[PDB]
Every structure is written in C-alpha cells, then in structure tokens.
Amino acid sequence: EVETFAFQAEIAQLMSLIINTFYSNKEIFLRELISNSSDALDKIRYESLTDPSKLDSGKELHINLIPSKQDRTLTIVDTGIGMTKADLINNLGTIAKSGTKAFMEALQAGADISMIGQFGVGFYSAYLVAEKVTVITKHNDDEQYAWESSAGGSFTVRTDTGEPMGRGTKVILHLKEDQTEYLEERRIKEIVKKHSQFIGYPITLFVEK
Ligand SMILES: CC(C)c1cc(Cn2cnc3c(Cl)nc(N)nc32)on1
C-alpha cells in the first residue's frame, strides 16, 4: 500500500522557492543533511543513557555518504533515532510550518537560502540538487518506512521492503542531471571539510566501485 499526501501549503511554497529561485551556492544541502543526522545521533545517544535497550537495534553511531553513478544518487545514511510514521506524515511538518514562515519572511528581508538551517527546515535544501528525494527510515518500536517526493505538492509514504536498516535514516538524493558533481569524491571531500568538519560522529565517504 502506497499512501499519497498533500504537503501543507506553506511547505509546498517553500519547496517551490527552493526549486525555482536562482541561487548558485547549492553545496550547502550537504551540511544541512549532515546536521540533521548529527542531531538524530545525539538524540538516540542521549536516550540510551537512561534506556540502554534503545541501542539493541545497533550500537554504532555514524554517518555514511554513499555515491552511486549507476543510480545517479548521493545517499546520506545515519544510525540516529529515525522517524516514525507520524513524524513523516504529520509531526515534523507541523513543527516545520513555523520555521518555513520565518525563513520566507527573512528571505524577503535580505536573508539568503544558505541560512535555511537557522530556521530549522534545512532538510528541504535537498531540492537544490535533487529532483526526487527518497527517505528510508526506521525508529525503534515503529516499522521501516519509505517517504518520497518530487515536489509538486505531494509526497508518499509506504512500508519499506528493502534491506532492513536496524535503526536510522537514509536520505537518497536523486540528483538533477546537471548536479552530478556531488557524486565526485573530491567534491564531497571539499564540502565536508568546509562545512561539516567538527561533527561529533565519524563521517565515512564511500568510494565508487
Ligand atoms: C522526511 C522529511 C519530512 C523530513 C526530514 C527532516 C529532518 N529530520 C527530522 N528528524 C530526523 C531524523 Cl530522526 N533523522 C534525520 N536524518 N533527519 C531528520 O524533517 N522532515
């Protein structure tokens, strides 16, 4: 079963702005996704201090960056807390409404798209480089889900039948045809050292076979 949902109007407007605005400094998407992964790793680590069983789904706390030339994808994998079905459909978007409005107003007052993370909605910077984003996620005591959207005002959620992940999130960026530089090892290394060099979890940049 695939369920299709409409974005909140403000989120759809944000996605259109990210897709349509002329803005050359697209590389900031990676720092935003790595920051989200780091936040998710912080959360599971904190919760494990009072409930060690929360790591029964995996003790390693890390971030992997995986390019695929065959699929034209860059995947950001973390073993953080993961997202529930309710997170994916309702709750993260409810939280994001506030930051979206503030970000859009800041842009009209002279802010820049690279500041998106200061409003807590940096996930959507993925659409600077991706025509479609697939999110595979697994939270303890919920199922493994695939969320997906090519924008246009809707997203889907389904139970995921792929390789079980244990716990965490994979953000699969289906890159636009002109954004394949983000598959290059040298380019990702440059961006990670520029914007994400103090993240408190190991970041492994996989190499393409
Ligand atoms: C899927 C769309 C709707 C989305 C993604 C985000 C950012 N985000 C919130 N919780 C997260 C966790 Cl637990 N892990 C990671 N990696 N990112 C997270 O917010 N909305």
Ligand SMILES: CC(C)c1cc(Cn2cnc3c(Cl)nc(N)nc32)on1
């Ligand atoms: C694991 C948790 C603490 C977390 C928080 C974030 C920040 N963040 C980035 N983009 C977001 C969107 Cl679009 N929505 C919402 N609600 N939060 C977003 O990322 N992960």
